[PDB]
Design a protein around this ligand. Structure first.
Ligand SMILES: O=C(N[C@@H](C(=O)NO)c1ccc(-c2cc(F)c(F)c(F)c2)cc1)[C@@H](F)C(F)(F)F
Ligand SMILES: [Mg+2]
Ligand SMILES: [Mg+2]
Ligand SMILES: [Mg+2]
Ligand SMILES: [Mg+2]
Ligand SMILES: [Zn+2]
Length: 889
């Protein structure tokens, strides 16, 4: 099993200057003819010519138009084509081949495949080798000349990278299109699409060069009415890159294409971005609210890759975070500016500290630039993406906007048209740092540890105030726990955005201040501090760390009410919740262990409940923020703070705390649920797909959150509200009516009603499936069986499989049933999926990531299912590799 090491990078002994492809699509097979115009590099030492080529059927291979013969001049083992060096030319030469591949039965959705009636490619990371022979690595840059042919009736729309330079008819009802793409590119950015596609289009005129860019968004005919918001988002993306970064699109045309079957969200193929339909298509009648921000982020994300990934590309795959962490960061800047809601940044942090923190304290922990890999298909992680983005964002926090923009432009101008590494980016940032600090002696060498060191730093605080001296001190410590990647962890460059709040009037006591913590510990002192402040720490979540604020709940409540920073207010609330959760958890655990007949629980802080009421009742406060404060921290955030977590005891703990708060605030909840209706459910723009109001959507989130709290509580006659909610035109509302009805006799009536509403739109039905999957039902296993038999069946669509099973795995009480029946069920699905799509099978492993954090019975149960999956004779490379790492084997 080949392990690739970052330190082993060496450039190829060969060069590929030109790729000329003929892709001929037929009913039962696809024939690919390829001529590679090649050369010998200065690094060549007379080695064999070895091409990647996976699952290819060879019809012929030639060098300089001379047929090569198997055995004597070459060998092929279904993974590598080896041409013996005595037969390899010493100067420029042409290599040609004709292979047969079979998109129809390509269910792994890598290489060239069929999604419904669309032929489509996915080449990142090493999928191009499933299409034709190549030296399949991103430093092998080449020009591409691509001809596609196909039955005209089935496949009237033909697309690839570059300009369409010819279209022609072919005898027998066929037709072709030729695309020439002169700029050099790595092969993972090659794409081809063929199908009966329908489109919306527009023309965009660039800000500075005033170039006309044609924008096309494509889908199957059935869903063409769902393309409009995507086009709006594309225009928005282009404008933001122009306005913030001064960057314009360089090509005459940009195509976005939705396909039903896709392993991830989307792919940034040059001039031909290809999307999971769930991340490109929406309409207000047929999509939940979440689709709108999803499409905005994903369209934005693929667009921003045109610079950070496409024009400036990767030397090697170990540099993945250089294009993904940076493009996620650009996408976050964009979406924050587009939505103008504080919950956009909060939602990113919420995801990082639950999902990515879990990963980073799991056996799978890695730095954002790993040292090795076996499977690229398993490399695309929340660590590389989301911790990557936080590391890219810290440069902005450290430099400020002006010098960050200067540094970023240095990176682009210096590396445009080339491969690059993480060091190139740090170097560019460092140049800006020298300018900002006004001495060329300043450096960011310590910053590189963010790329190489794994694990989440813990940052903790102590304070001192001298009332006579008017002198305030913040003592800060950082610590990262040793793990498998470093025995000794080094201190990082941690930027701490801080404010000081006057507790008497809630005002700022100092100007904007970013503490630069560069040692294991430091003391930051402030003079002329007139009164003892409450510190506002890591404003905007200014570093990806565990924050231990060492504040009292009284101080935290003051910040929650009066601080200026949304994240610190949100975090202060989170910290109050966590102190309560840990306390009640231990009390419940003790009662369980000692088999107590009676015991006490510590009630929720009443001033805290009063603070929530205060904020909820404030008509000038933000609805999205309001929905965060009435929600306990995510289970996957909580689990980072508890050893041997008994999921039952945690379920009882959450139940107690929600009941405590609802016993005081339910009337407030109910009043708000009713008063929010007019604005939240306003239909004025329901038939305008260009009008998206993120505040209004946050009001609906708040109503739907409140409705859930009231339904769980069995608030008097809340079922009436539920039934009326089911008649709302907004799918976020009527799907919510299904999940909250779980607590009532009406559940299966709403199940049928909402099914009938959902069944004729592919993506809406997947949303319905998710809603059922995550329904708080005691009969949820019986319900899942019904979904399998009646709706899911033997679908190989990753959207269908993920929709049915993943939401259920977050059911704390039932997925973690002490019998192990939920672990058994998800392992059976993983093994079944692994037969045809190893990448998605490993995605479906996600609930096992925390296995060694649970109580010892559940650790044993999970480990048993993982060992069972590992023992499957036909297990894929992906899944084997992943489970071996996860189980510390
Ligand atoms: O869709 C995502 N990421 C893709 C991306 O970065 N688009 O710009 C992405 C694209 C391709 C792959 C990928 C990697 C492989 F190794 C494959 F085999 C494969 F089929 C897809 C993974 C993630 C999500 F991270 C996002 F962006 F949040 F939606
Ligand atoms: Mg094959
Ligand atoms: Mg503009
Ligand atoms: Mg389908
Ligand atoms: Mg290990
Ligand atoms: Zn990306």
């Amino acid at each position: 099993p080949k392990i690739h090491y970052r330190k082993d990078y060496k450039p190829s002994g060969f060069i590929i200057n030109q790729v000329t492809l003929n892709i001929n699509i037929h009913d039962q097979e696809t024939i690919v003819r390829s001529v590679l115009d090649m050369d010998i590099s200065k690094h060549n030492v007379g080695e064999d010519l070895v091409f990647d080529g996976v699952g290819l059927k060879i019809n012929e291979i030639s060098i300089n138009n001379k047929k090569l013969v198997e055995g004597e001049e070459y060998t092929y083992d279904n993974e590598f084509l080896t041409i013996f060096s005595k037969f390899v030319p010493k100067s420029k030469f042409a290599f040609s081949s004709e292979v047969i591949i079979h998109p129809e039965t390509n269910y792994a959705l890598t290489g060239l495949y069929k999604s419904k009636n669309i032929i489509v490619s996915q080449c990142e990371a090493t999928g191009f080798r499933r299409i034709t022979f190549f030296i399949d690595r991103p430093d092998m840059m080449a020009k591409y000349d691509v001809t596609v042919t196909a039955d005209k009736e089935k496949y009237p729309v033909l697309l690839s990278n570059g300009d369409k330079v010819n279209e022609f008819e072919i005898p027998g009802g066929r037709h072709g299109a030729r695309f020439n793409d002169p700029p050099l590119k790595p092969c993972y950015l090659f794409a081809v699409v063929a199908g009966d596609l329908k489109h919306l289009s527009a023309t965009y005129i660039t800000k500075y060069t005033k170039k006309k860019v044609e924008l096309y968004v494509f889908s199957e005919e059935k869903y063409v009415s769902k393309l409009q918001w995507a086009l709006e988002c594309l225009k928005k993306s282009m404008a933001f890159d122009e306005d913030y970064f001064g960057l314009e699109y360089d090509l005459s045309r940009l195509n976005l294409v939705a396909v039903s079957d896709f392993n991830v969200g989307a792919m940034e193929n040059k001039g031909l971005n290809i999307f999971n339909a769930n991340s490109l298509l929406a309409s207000k009648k047929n999509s939940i609210d979440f689709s709108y921000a999803r499409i905005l982020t994903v369209v934005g994300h693929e667009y921003f890759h045109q610079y950070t990934g496409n024009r400036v590309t990767l030397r090697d795959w170990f540099q993945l975070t250089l294009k993904e962490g940076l493009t996620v960061h650009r996408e976050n800047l964009f979406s924050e500016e587009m939505t103008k809601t504080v919950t956009t940044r909060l939602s990113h942090v919420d995801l990082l500290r639950s999902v990515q923190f879990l990963e980073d304290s799991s056996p799978l922990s890695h730095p954002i630039r790993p040292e090795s890999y076996v499977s690229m298909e398993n490399f695309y992680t929340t660590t590389v993406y989301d911790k990557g983005s936080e590391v890219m964002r810290m440069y902005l926090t450290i430099l400020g906007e002006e010098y960050y923009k200067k540094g970023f432009d240095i990176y682009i101008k210096k590396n445009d048209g080339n491969t690059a590494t993480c060091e190139d980016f740090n170097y560019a940032m460092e140049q800006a740092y020298k300018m900002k600090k006004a001495d060329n002696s300043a450096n960011l060498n310590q910053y590189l540890l963010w790329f190489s060191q794994s694990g989440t730093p813990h940052v903790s605080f102590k304070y001192n105030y001298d009332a006579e001296k008017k002198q305030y001190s913040i003592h800060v410590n950082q610590y990262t726990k040793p793990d498998e990647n470093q025995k000794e962890k080094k201190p990082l460059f941690i930027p701490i955005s801080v404010g000081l709040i006057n507790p008497e009037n809630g005002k700022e006591m100092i100007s904007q201040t970013t503490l630069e913590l560069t040692k294991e510990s430091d003391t930051f002192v402030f003079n002329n501090i007139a009164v003892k402040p409450i510190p506002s720490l890591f404003r905007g979540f200014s570093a990806p760390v565990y924050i231990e604020d060492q504040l009292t709940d009284e101080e935290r409540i003051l910040l929650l009410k009066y601080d200026s920073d949304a994240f610190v207010r949100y975090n202060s609330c989170t910290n109050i919740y966590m102190k309560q959760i840990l306390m009640n958890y231990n009390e419940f655990l003790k009662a369980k262990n000692e088999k107590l007949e009676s015991f006490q629980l510590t009630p929720v802080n009443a001033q805290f409940i009063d603070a929530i009421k205060y904020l909820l009742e404030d008509p000038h406060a933000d609805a999205g923020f309001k929905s965060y404060i009435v929600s306990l921290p995510q289970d996957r955030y909580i689990i980072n703070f508890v050893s041997n977590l008994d999921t039952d005891v945690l379920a009882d703990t959450k139940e107690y705390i929600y009941k405590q708060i609802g016993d005081k605030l339910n009337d407030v909840y109910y009043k708000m649920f009713k008063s929010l209706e007019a604005k939240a459910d306003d239909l004025t723009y329901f038939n305008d797909e260009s009008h998206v109001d993120f505040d209004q959507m946050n009001m609906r989130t708040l109503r739907n959150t409140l409705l859930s709290l009231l339904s769980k509580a069995q608030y008097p006659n809340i079922l009436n509200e539920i039934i009326e909610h089911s008649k709302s035109p907004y799918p976020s509302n009527w799907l919510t009516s299904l999940s909250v009805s779980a607590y009532f006799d009406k559940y299966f009536e709403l199940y049928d009603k909402t099914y009938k509403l959902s069944k004729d739109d592919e993506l809406l039905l997947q949303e319905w499936l998710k809603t059922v999957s995550r329904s708080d039902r005691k009969d949820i296993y019986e319900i899942l069986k019904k979904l399998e038999n009646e709706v899911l069946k033997d679908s190989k669509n990753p959207n269908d499989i993920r929709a049915v099973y993943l939401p259920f795995t977050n059911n704390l009480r039932r997925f973690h049933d002490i019998s192990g029946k939920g672990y058994k069920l998800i392992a059976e699905v993983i093994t079944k999926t692994d037969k045809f799509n190893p990448m998605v099978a490993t995605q479906l492993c996600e609930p096992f990531k925390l296995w060694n954090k649970l109580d010892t019975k559940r650790q044993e149960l999970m480990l048993n299912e993982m060992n069972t999956m590992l023992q499957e004779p036909q297990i894929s490379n992906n899944l084997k590799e992943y489970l071996l790492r996860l189980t510390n084997k």
